[PDB]
Amino acid sequence: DFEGFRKLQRADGFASILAIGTANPPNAVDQSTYPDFYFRITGNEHNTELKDKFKRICERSAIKQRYMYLTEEILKKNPDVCAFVEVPSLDARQAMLAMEVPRLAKEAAEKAIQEWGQSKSGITHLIFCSTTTPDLPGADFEVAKLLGLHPSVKRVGVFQHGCFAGGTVLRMAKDLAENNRGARVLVICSETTAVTFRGPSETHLDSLVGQALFGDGASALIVGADPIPQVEKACFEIVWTAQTVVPNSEGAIGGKVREVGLTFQLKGAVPDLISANIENCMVEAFSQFKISDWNKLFWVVHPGGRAILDRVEAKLNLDPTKLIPTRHVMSEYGNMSSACVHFILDQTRKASLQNGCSTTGEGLEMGVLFGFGPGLTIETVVLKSVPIQ
Amino acid sequence: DFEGFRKLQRADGFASILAIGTANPPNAVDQSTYPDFYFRITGNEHNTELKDKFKRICERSAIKQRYMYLTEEILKKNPDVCAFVEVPSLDARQAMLAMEVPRLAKEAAEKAIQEWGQSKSGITHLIFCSTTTPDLPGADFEVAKLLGLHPSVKRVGVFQHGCFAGGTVLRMAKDLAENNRGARVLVICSETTAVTFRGPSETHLDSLVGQALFGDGASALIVGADPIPQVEKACFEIVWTAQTVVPNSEGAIGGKVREVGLTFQLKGAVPDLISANIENCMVEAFSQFKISDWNKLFWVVHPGGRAILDRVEAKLNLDPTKLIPTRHVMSEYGNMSSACVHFILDQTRKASLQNGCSTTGEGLEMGVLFGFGPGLTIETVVLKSVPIQ
């Protein structure tokens, strides 16, 4: 009865994505205009040297747009946020965060929930991810509250992991769904530049990189194993996952929560470091399925930057069609951190539909999903598309 | 094909505790002399009223000693950590945290690893918990790095969850160890008051309490399913888990990460909220095991404070023996937040051993574990004991 309590307790098939919800703040920022706006709101028009370094950066970021909670209104009222680090500004950011992060998350759940089609009362687990969370309880408690989730929903907050959390969230979703029969996991990633936006400094060119690539956004997935026939529609199946630390990459990507808010540190080595180890990951994940041709899988890569994508595409020489949904997202949404990959997952199943593809993975049956962040950490996830009738 | 990949990818038995390690900072502080010392080191000797008020709180705490990272020499070189909230102290605390938390976590786990007596390489998962974490990557990465863990350990950091985290980690460990055949999760909870210690204030008595209750410590567990016979020795198994939010209980427990560090709010209504609802959690986690008499189970409840334990016990009408292990640890360590319940698990198995009980649960077969924190949430964990022979 005890060894019997286990089998009945766990689920059957693979944890599957039964819905995908997305949301962003109202302020769409045109990248072609950001350089003038950025240097004007921070009061740095007098430093023509920097501006050109930033312009070059935005102009080569492959990002044409980004949604930002931070608007000129909020910035003119928060001069401390416009400074580099000469004055503290954590508490003001923290307030923005306690309000915005949960708000974007709910908006994403509400869409995911609706698509899913079942009562929110059926959600058993909640996985919440954000670069940071301002208080105790974390944002996971706040979002559950706002959404109206049952009080016995088991929450897990994933804070301060990094841009790779988009993958770890799926790795966690997978184990939650498959070890608990009849379970439905609500997986949410919510990010804003409110905690990281700050003024430019010539002596901190890396931080200037983050000011041109980071954008706001929230994604919501409903994950569950053993979907109900004719009721729940799965569009992806989470097959296998792995996490690793790239060798000799210590300090490559990092951040610090300090009195001046969150500080971003990024080494020029990241692209190299990811390219030189991305293949190992592939053989470790796909050889077990007897797959050696990378181009036979569909792709979902975290858009950490234009250079990183071009590298991976070369070291693996994936054809030009692989990073299309991924670049589609980066272009229209920028680097929304952990949320990015899920936005691409929706972009992928969308294109598949609008193009008469045999499956949700653009005709291909299997695919990989990548997460890159502080570590440097590499998060791998093997998917299984679903056939579209 | 996949219906086989799934069956082989997952473990057969029950997630089990295969080892428990504990660690604490050198500085052993006696609750008896803390009032004079606490007010001295903070330059508040003159305000005899608040001091006598704090002595009175310490004398009811039922805490005889705690282990603190912050020594007198450290507080003397850091005056800002001594203020209440008149001067910022986040940065200084983050520095203390970046080094102390992972250090303590590392000591706890080396102990844990040793008992388990298996290779570190065999560690495929890591669950790290701490009230907070100063940077990105979090303490999970750092702990792996100090531990010389395998670059591919699947790590997860649980930050800013609260005093109830001790159980959410077991809830997380169970799903990980049971859905991954061969998986061995290293569970670590490291906490220190360095991020919360501040001077006294007469307008913030809820904060006073906290200065007398919280202490430092690190706990470490090796969790895994299907333990190798006569190679790995299990002591506790995780059968069923749950977390819940007690109705209308917001603000009772919470904390804010600000430029002055982690502030802490604690409404006096906490003992009653937990008590008038814990009974409900027991009938949800035990009727399925045809059990209605709480006293037939051994107990592991978070030592939030004497009152919470006094109310819970009176409410459920537990035998003065149930909380011998809980009250004993709270007495020798105090509230080490998330790591307390693990200290209790350990003390509980040690006591069963010294006394000559039939099982690791002081003779009983099944047991319950509770965690209380910001939410207000309650983590319930039904544990299975193992025979001693």
Coordinates of C-alpha atoms in Angstrom, one line a residue, chain A residues 11-12 14-19 113 116 118-127 149 153-154 173 176-178 180-187 221-229 231-234:
Chain A
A11 CA 1.7 10.8 -13.5
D12 CA 2.0 8.7 -16.6
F14 CA 5.7 13.3 -20.3
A15 CA 5.0 16.7 -18.8
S16 CA 3.6 18.7 -21.6
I17 CA 3.0 22.4 -22.4
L18 CA -0.8 22.8 -22.6
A19 CA -0.8 26.6 -23.0
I113 CA -5.3 30.1 -18.3
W116 CA -5.8 26.2 -21.4
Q118 CA -9.9 24.7 -17.5
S119 CA -10.7 26.3 -14.2
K120 CA -7.9 28.1 -12.5
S121 CA -8.9 26.0 -9.5
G122 CA -7.3 23.1 -11.2
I123 CA -3.8 24.6 -11.1
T124 CA -1.8 22.6 -8.5
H125 CA 1.6 24.2 -8.7
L126 CA 3.0 27.6 -9.4
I127 CA 6.6 28.2 -10.4
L149 CA -5.3 30.6 -7.2
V153 CA -1.3 25.7 -4.6
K154 CA 2.3 24.7 -4.0
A173 CA 8.0 22.1 -14.3
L176 CA 6.5 18.6 -10.7
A177 CA 4.1 17.5 -13.4
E178 CA 5.4 13.9 -13.8
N180 CA 2.3 14.2 -9.2
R181 CA -0.6 12.6 -11.1
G182 CA -3.3 15.0 -12.3
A183 CA -1.0 18.0 -11.6
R184 CA -1.0 21.2 -13.6
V185 CA 1.9 23.6 -13.1
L186 CA 1.6 27.3 -13.7
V187 CA 5.1 28.5 -14.8
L221 CA 2.8 28.2 -19.3
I222 CA 0.5 25.6 -18.0
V223 CA 2.4 22.3 -17.7
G224 CA 1.0 18.9 -17.0
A225 CA 1.4 15.2 -17.7
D226 CA -1.4 13.0 -19.1
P227 CA -3.4 15.7 -20.8
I228 CA -7.2 15.2 -21.0
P229 CA -8.3 13.8 -24.4
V231 CA -10.0 18.8 -23.7
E232 CA -6.3 19.7 -23.0
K233 CA -4.2 20.4 -26.1
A234 CA -0.4 19.9 -25.6

